[PDB]
Motif scaffolding. Structure first.
Motif, PDB file in Angstrom:
ATOM      1  N   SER A   1       9.348 -11.773   8.121  1.00 30.06           N
ATOM      2  CA  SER A   1      10.058 -10.499   8.399  1.00 30.06           C
ATOM      3  C   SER A   1      11.157 -10.334   7.351  1.00 30.06           C
ATOM      4  CB  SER A   1      10.609 -10.485   9.807  1.00 30.06           C
ATOM      5  OG  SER A   1      11.215  -9.238  10.113  1.00 30.06           O
TER       6      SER A   1
ATOM      7  N   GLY B   1      11.765  -8.127  13.036  1.00 31.98           N
ATOM      8  CA  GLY B   1      12.754  -7.035  13.095  1.00 31.98           C
ATOM      9  C   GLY B   1      13.960  -7.361  13.956  1.00 31.98           C
ATOM     10  N   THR B   2      13.996  -8.502  14.655  1.00 33.48           N
ATOM     11  CA  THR B   2      15.140  -8.844  15.549  1.00 33.48           C
ATOM     12  C   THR B   2      16.291  -9.490  14.768  1.00 33.48           C
ATOM     13  OG1 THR B   2      14.283 -11.006  16.223  1.00 33.48           O
ATOM     14  CG2 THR B   2      13.749  -9.109  17.637  1.00 33.48           C
ATOM     15  N   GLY B   3      16.064  -9.918  13.522  1.00 34.61           N
ATOM     16  CA  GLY B   3      17.105 -10.519  12.670  1.00 34.61           C
ATOM     17  C   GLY B   3      17.872  -9.450  11.914  1.00 34.61           C
ATOM     18  N   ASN B   4      17.741  -9.450  10.591  1.00 33.44           N
ATOM     19  CA  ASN B   4      18.432  -8.536   9.646  1.00 33.44           C
ATOM     20  C   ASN B   4      18.304  -7.080  10.118  1.00 33.44           C
ATOM     21  OD1 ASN B   4      19.681  -7.980   6.871  1.00 33.44           O
ATOM     22  ND2 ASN B   4      17.731  -6.884   6.688  1.00 33.44           N
ATOM     23  N   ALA B   5      17.115  -6.648  10.539  1.00 28.65           N
ATOM     24  CA  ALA B   5      16.821  -5.234  10.890  1.00 28.65           C
ATOM     25  C   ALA B   5      17.467  -4.831  12.225  1.00 28.65           C
ATOM     26  CB  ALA B   5      15.327  -5.023  10.911  1.00 28.65           C
TER      27      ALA B   5
ATOM     28  N   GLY C   1      11.012  -5.794   8.148  1.00 27.48           N
ATOM     29  CA  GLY C   1      11.575  -5.948   9.505  1.00 27.48           C
ATOM     30  C   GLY C   1      11.997  -4.618  10.116  1.00 27.48           C
TER      31      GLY C   1
END
Ligand SMILES: [Cl-]
Ligand SMILES: [Cl-]
Length: 180
Positions: free
Chosen positions: A40, A125-129, A96
């Protein structure tokens, strides 16, 4: 399409979605072996933070170089590289911030094109995004259900989400129980 949710190992949960075993666990995705591992990343394919940092550090500089060069050559929705020094045949680098259902649909189709049987992905997509974990969980499982409903499952037998945060694993477990 949904089977019973069970636990084959401590903190691991699985259920059938049609013919596919869908499994979730918390841990380090770079320890996993699968035909494809999903990264991601950002729309520059140059993210090296959180799970993308672990993946690129373990995959090695040949995977990093290939991402950056493919990203220069055209505008990509996702990039397929070799596995480098990860235990996989290909890494699929997805953005992401993109629609997670679209991203997982693309990964499933690319895996069938290569006659691959196993996929490992993070909570895309739950990190940086900073996409909401329940929306991401809904999107990943919806993508697999749509794939199965279309009769597309042939080579793909196992989809495993290895999740950095146990608190996000809890969200995936709840989404699985909703569908059971
Ligand atoms: Cl992300
Ligand atoms: Cl994750």
């Amino acid at each position: 399409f949904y089977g019973t949710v069970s636990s084959p190992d401590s903190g691991v949960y699985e259920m059938k979605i049609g013919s596919i075993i869908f499994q979730v666990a918390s841990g380090d995705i770079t320890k996993e072996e699968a035909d494809v591992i999903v990264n991601s990343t950002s729309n520059s394919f140059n993210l090296k933070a959180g799970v993308s940092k672990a993946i690129l550090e373990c995959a090695g500089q040949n995977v990093e170089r290939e991402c950056s060069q493919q990203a220069q050559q055209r505008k990509n929705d996702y990039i397929i590289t070799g596995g480098g020094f990860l235990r996989c045949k290909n890494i699929i680098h997805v953005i992401g911030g993109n629609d997670v259902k679209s991203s997982v649909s693309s990964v499933l189709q690319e895996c069938e094109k290569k006659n691959y049987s196993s996929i490992c992905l993070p909570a895309i997509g739950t990190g940086n995004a900073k996409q909401h974990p329940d929306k991401v969980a809904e999107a990943i499982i919806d993508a697999i259900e749509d794939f199965v409903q279309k009769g597309s499952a042939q080579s793909v037998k196992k989809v495993k989400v290895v999740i950095f945060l146990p608190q996000v694993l809890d969200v995936f477990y709840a989404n699985m129980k909703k569908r059971e």
